[PDB]
Amino acid sequence: MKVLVTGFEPFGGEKINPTERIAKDLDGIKIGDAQVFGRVLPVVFGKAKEVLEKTLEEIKPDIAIHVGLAPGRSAISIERIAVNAIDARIPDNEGKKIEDEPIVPGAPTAYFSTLPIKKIMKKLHERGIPAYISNSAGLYLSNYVMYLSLHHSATKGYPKMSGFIHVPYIPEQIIDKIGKGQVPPSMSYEMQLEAVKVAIEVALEELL
Amino acid sequence: MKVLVTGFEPFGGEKINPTERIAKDLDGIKIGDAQVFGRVLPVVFGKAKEVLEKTLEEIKPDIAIHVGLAPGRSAISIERIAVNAIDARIPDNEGKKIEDEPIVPGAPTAYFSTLPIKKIMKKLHERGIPAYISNSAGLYLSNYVMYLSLHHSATKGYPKMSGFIHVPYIPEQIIDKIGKGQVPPSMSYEMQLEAVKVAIEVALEELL
Amino acid sequence: MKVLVTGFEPFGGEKINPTERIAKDLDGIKIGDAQVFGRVLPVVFGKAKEVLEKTLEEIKPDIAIHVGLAPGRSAISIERIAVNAIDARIPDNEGKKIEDEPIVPGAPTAYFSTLPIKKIMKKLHERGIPAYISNSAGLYLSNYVMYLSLHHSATKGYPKMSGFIHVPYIPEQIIDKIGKGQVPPSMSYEMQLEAVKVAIEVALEELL
Amino acid sequence: MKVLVTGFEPFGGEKINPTERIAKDLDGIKIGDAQVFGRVLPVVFGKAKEVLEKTLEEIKPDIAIHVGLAPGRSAISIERIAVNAIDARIPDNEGKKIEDEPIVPGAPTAYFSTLPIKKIMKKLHERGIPAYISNSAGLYLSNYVMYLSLHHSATKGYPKMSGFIHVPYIPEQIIDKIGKGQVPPSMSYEMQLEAVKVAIEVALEELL
């Protein structure tokens, strides 16, 4: 068994992206006889697609779990659907702002996550980790990779399972926000890392 | 040096109140040569006043830090002011619902917290703990005790410092909320307990 | 030219549904040489499908604009995508609660709205009406009808344009909410009705 | 009978302040045998105090209702208390940023609004206008004037009634916010103006 976990670099002014640590922290660990690979993707259209495709092609994971930062969200959110579209509210890390454009022309309008999202959520609740199902991963880079991953799956037959998980800001990221007159929700890094491992575990239990 | 920390029992349907554990967890510990006392107050008008008065009178703390649950708040909030009024949106744990009534007739309309609130907040930020200054502790039991405590201070000369701190829901309390179609902010119990100790420490450093 | 506008009856305990009045208010009016038909759909799975199919089949509209109540949303929201799924958080008006089930088995995972959503939004802004693009209409009845409508469109060739618009609570609906300790956003009925007419107009300008 | 209504000029980057129109719109009108005076105050510490004091001294109102913009609030909010403190998160329109400073040294920590706030709220509800009681008017200019007004009242014996009312953004102000990736609540200008007249009316009915 091989599992691929990806995270994203900082973006939109944020100095950190909790998903970057998550990916690095999970890279190389083993859960049962399953080997986990952690890779950090750039918040850049195009380049991110290349890194993703090469990684999937090089590792050929059975399961692919992509994690991203969802500023403002109060709990762990498991994405149910990836849509074939890009409409960036802000530019990516290269300065490009793509608006109303398909990710893969002619490809399906959308793909359902193949991760056992309800069991993952239920398992997190048992661990006392707030989590829910999101029906939109935005139309920025998180959705971008989530879509490409599921498309690769429907196209090449692997990974067997692919999905996306969004995590809230970690506490320390809230500090400089307070000054700007507003305090968004946060979740400790430990609970976030824990949530992803749980997701991997439930995914492994399910996959075959 | 003697420090008094209070918490509240569950209320409003909640099965737990993180401040109850905090009080019990801090009871009996020593921070430097300072003895900390932890007491859980009932979410009941009148009865809560008696317990508070007796405790203050029995222990005669130099510092009094009262902690409560603020459902919906996303970070640690340090109260700046206690108002001489009661206007309960819901009844207390005894079924009574007091509306537009003074706490202490003839007493001052309000009292400023005597805790070094700005330093406490600043110290929490350094620890990476989101925190801010709240200018209203509500008009329920949190405000009730905060007011009575500061009134006891202005009246008897002790404690020298008195204030109130509100904490968010802890993660596990969010689980059953998700079903009811809504996910409020939360903060891990560990960070909450930590925040209170920090507050105590900064208070001790300040007090004399 | 024929335009079909639908609304929903009250649901989830709400005594009113602003979209019901909207539909009734727009029924029978003419915008240019375009005849508008307003119909109120029941917040009931299955039954709602029948009413929708019959209405579309009987009127055979060139444009179909379905409106619904989105409790909590602060401005007019134009839906970008309808997904082939049902996962009701609450039961419908008949007491049934469908979870994780497709709307049309074997049908596409999702459909993009064919209404000129960006122009509609832009036109509303010019009128000073807050509006934005929503990328998820929920998985309750709004999404249900939005999907069925676009599926009917891809299947029968009509209507040429189909989409969904969610409106906030109208002010009067907020009154009894205040007691329950919370005040959600609202938008006056007049602005809501106005927004829908604008949408119809932009749709007509676009359609051919 | 004489009633004084004040509003504020634009501030914090906002190009408009709905309270400015409200004041101008109500200036000179008569409600029964009561003469209403509408004055716009500058969002400037010090200068605002002078304008307020001169106005109160020149008109010597029986009732003083001060209105302000509360960005983000979803309904009409009637302030219950004014605190003797300034802690500006942002500078005023002259560039000054006052932090942790009393408004009137030696004066009471706080003043309760003398307007019949509960009746005003109840009357607005009957009109279908969402409204609630706020227990904090912030520590910026709204609180500043609210305090000074009630202090003038306790000091000079007039006005007999003084209070503050905060209104949400009006719809048009939300338009350019949408771009910045966020849509706060709003309330039509008409409902806002209406709410203030109601407040004046209830105040008149009450005052003597």
Asked if A1 and A201 count as a contact pair (C-beta separation under 8 A), the reply is no
Asked if D131 and D160 count as a contact pair (C-beta separation under 8 A), the reply is no
Radius of gyration of chain D (CA): 16
Least Cα separation, residue A33 to chain C (angstroms): 32
Q: Tell me the C-alpha to C-alpha distance, in Å, between residue D23 and each of C130, D7, D150.
A: 25, 5, 19
Rounded to 10 degrees, the C-alpha dihedral C131/C136/C141/C147 comes to: 100
- CA A81/CA C160 separation, integer angstroms: 26
User: Helices B189-206 and B18-26: crossing angle, nearest 10°?
Assistant: 50
Q: Tell me the C-alpha to C-alpha distance, in Å, between residue C81 and each of A41, A136, B93, C67, C199.
A: 27, 10, 47, 14, 17
Least Cα separation, residue D50 to chain C (angstroms): 36
SS3 label, residue B201: helix
**Which chains does chain C touch, 3 or more C-beta pairs < 8 A?**
A, B, D
> Is A187 within 8 Å of B186 when comparing Cβ atoms?
yes
- CA C110/CA A93 separation, integer angstroms: 30
Phi, psi of A156 (to 5 degrees): -100, -10
Provide the residue type at C11 as one letter: F
Q: Tell me the C-alpha to C-alpha distance, in Å, between residue D197 and each of A36, D20, D25, D69, D146.
A: 66, 15, 10, 17, 18
Closest CA to A83 of A151, A19, A133, A153: A151
Residues for chain D: how many in total?
Answer: 208
Chain A residues with CB within 8 Å of chain B CB: 74-75, 125, 128-132, 171-172, 174-175, 178, 183-188, 190-191
SS3 label, residue D109: coil
- CA D196/CA D18 separation, integer angstroms: 12
Choose the closest CB to C135 out of A108, A112, A136: A136
The vertex-C190 CA angle with C187 and C193, nearest 5°, equals 95
Give which of A101, A135, A139 to mutate to test C binding, by max C Cβ within 10 Å. Answer: A135
Give which of B11, B73, B87, B89 to mutate to test C binding, by max C Cβ within 10 Å. Answer: B89
Phi, psi of C66 (to 5 degrees): -100, 125
Asked if D187 and D132 count as a contact pair (C-beta separation under 8 A), the reply is no
Rounded to 10 degrees, the C-alpha dihedral B197/B199/B203/B204 comes to: 20
- CA C153/CA C130 separation, integer angstroms: 29
Asked if A170 and C170 count as a contact pair (C-beta separation under 8 A), the reply is no
Helix (H) or strand (E) holding D5: strand D2-8
Provide the residue type at D41 as one letter: L
> Can you give the residue range of the structural domain that contains C14?
1-208
Q: Residue D181: its chain A contacts at CB < 8 A?
A: 89-90
Closest CA to A7 of A51, A54, A46, A58: A51
Chain C residues with CB within 8 Å of chain D CB: 74-75, 125, 128-132, 171-172, 174-175, 177-178, 183-188, 190-191
Asked if B49 and B147 count as a contact pair (C-beta separation under 8 A), the reply is no
The vertex-C142 CA angle with A130 and C118, nearest 5°, equals 95
Q: How many CA atoms lie within 13 A of B191 on its CB side?
A: 29
Phi, psi of A96 (to 5 degrees): -90, 140
Least Cα separation, residue B89 to chain D (angstroms): 11
Sign of CA dihedral D20, D25, D31, D33: positive
Choose the closest CB to B111 out of D85, D109, D135: D109
Nearest CA in chain B to D112: B109
For chains A and B, CB pairs below 8 A equal 65
> Is A171 within 8 Å of B74 when comparing Cβ atoms?
no
3-state SS track over D42-81: CCCCCHHHHHHHHHHHHHCCCEEEEEEECCCCCCEEEECE
Q: Residue C73: its chain A contacts at CB < 8 A?
A: none
A166 DSSP assignment: E
Method: X-ray
b/e for A131-163, b at 16 or more Cβ within 10 A? bbbbbbbbbbbbbbbbbbbbbbbeeeebbebbb
Closest CA to C110 of A180, A162, A80, D67: A80
Task: Say if residue C38 is exposed, middle or buried (CB neighbours under 10 Å; 0-12, 13-18, 19+).
Answer: buried
Least Cα separation, residue B47 to chain C (angstroms): 25
A15 DSSP assignment: S
Q: How many CA atoms lie within 13 A of A196 on its CB side?
A: 36
Nearest CA in chain C to B138: C181
Nearest CA in chain A to B190: A188
Asked if A89 and A172 count as a contact pair (C-beta separation under 8 A), the reply is no
The vertex-D190 CA angle with D43 and D80, nearest 5°, equals 55
Asked if C109 and A81 count as a contact pair (C-beta separation under 8 A), the reply is yes
β pairing state of C34-41 and C2-8: parallel
Task: Say if residue D21 is exposed, middle or buried (CB neighbours under 10 Å; 0-12, 13-18, 19+).
Answer: middle
D30-31: strand order across its sheet:
D30-31, D34-41, D2-8, D63-69, D161-167, D76-79, D131-134
> Is A135 within 8 Å of C133 when comparing Cβ atoms?
no
User: Helices D141-156 and D47-59: crossing angle, nearest 10°?
Assistant: 40
The number of folded domains in chain D is 1
DSSP codes of every residue in chain C: -EEEEEEE---TT-S--HHHHHHHHHTT-EETTEEEEEEEEPS-TTHHHHHHHHHHHHH--SEEEEEEE-TT--SEEEE-EEES-B--SS--TTS----SB-SSTTS-SEEE--S-HHHHHHHHHHTT--EEEES---SSHHHHHHHHHHHHHHHHS--SEEEEEEE-B-GGGTHHHHHTT----B--HHHHHHHHHHHHHHHHHH--
Nearest CA in chain D to A180: D89
Chain C residues with CB within 8 Å of chain B CB: 89-90, 181
Task: Say if residue A39 is exposed, middle or buried (CB neighbours under 10 Å; 0-12, 13-18, 19+).
Answer: buried
Least Cα separation, residue A110 to chain D (angstroms): 24
- CA A12/CA A100 separation, integer angstroms: 20
Identify each DSSP E strand in D70-143 by its residue range: 76-79, 81-83, 110-112, 131-134
State the CB neighbour count (10 A cutoff) for residue D72. 12
- CA C28/CA C38 separation, integer angstroms: 7
Resolution (in Å) of the shown entry?
A: 2.5
Asked if D134 and D80 count as a contact pair (C-beta separation under 8 A), the reply is yes
Choose the closest CB to B130 out of A74, A174, A190: A174
Least Cα separation, residue D98 to chain A (angstroms): 15
Chain A residues with CB within 8 Å of chain D CB: 89-90, 181
Helix (H) or strand (E) holding B133: strand B131-134
- CA A118/CA A137 separation, integer angstroms: 17
SS3 label, residue B25: helix
> Is B186 within 8 Å of A75 when comparing Cβ atoms?
yes
Radius of gyration of chain B (CA): 16
Least Cα separation, residue A131 to chain D (angstroms): 23
Question: Per the omega criterion (within 30 degrees of 0), is the bond before C159 cis?
Answer: yes
CATH assignment at residue D50: 3.40.630.20
Q: Tell me the C-alpha to C-alpha distance, in Å, between residue C156 and each of A53, C106, C159, C174, C203.
A: 38, 17, 8, 41, 20
- CA C168/CA C151 separation, integer angstroms: 26
SS3 label, residue A98: coil
Contacting residues for D54 by C-beta, under 8 A, at least 6 apart = none
Q: Residue C90: its chain B contacts at CB < 8 A?
A: 181
Q: Residue A106: its chain C contacts at CB < 8 A?
A: none
Choose the closest CB to C89 out of B89, B90, B181: B181
Asked if C73 and A73 count as a contact pair (C-beta separation under 8 A), the reply is no
Question: Per the omega criterion (within 30 degrees of 0), is the bond before C130 cis?
Answer: no
Nearest CA in chain A to D178: A89
> Is C171 within 8 Å of D74 when comparing Cβ atoms?
no
Closest CA to D188 of D164, D163, D161, D169: D169
A127: its two tokens: 């661990």
> Is C133 within 8 Å of A109 when comparing Cβ atoms?
no
Looking at the DSSP bridge assignments, the partners of residue A82 are: A111
For chains B and D, CB pairs below 8 A equal 37
Q: Residue B118: its chain D contacts at CB < 8 A?
A: 100
State the CB neighbour count (10 A cutoff) for residue C164. 28
Question: Per the omega criterion (within 30 degrees of 0), is the bond before A159 cis?
Answer: yes
Sign of CA dihedral A102, A105, A110, A112: negative
Sign of CA dihedral A47, A53, A56, A57: negative
Q: Residue A124: its chain B contacts at CB < 8 A?
A: none
β pairing state of A110-112 and A81-83: antiparallel
> Is B85 within 8 Å of D109 when comparing Cβ atoms?
no
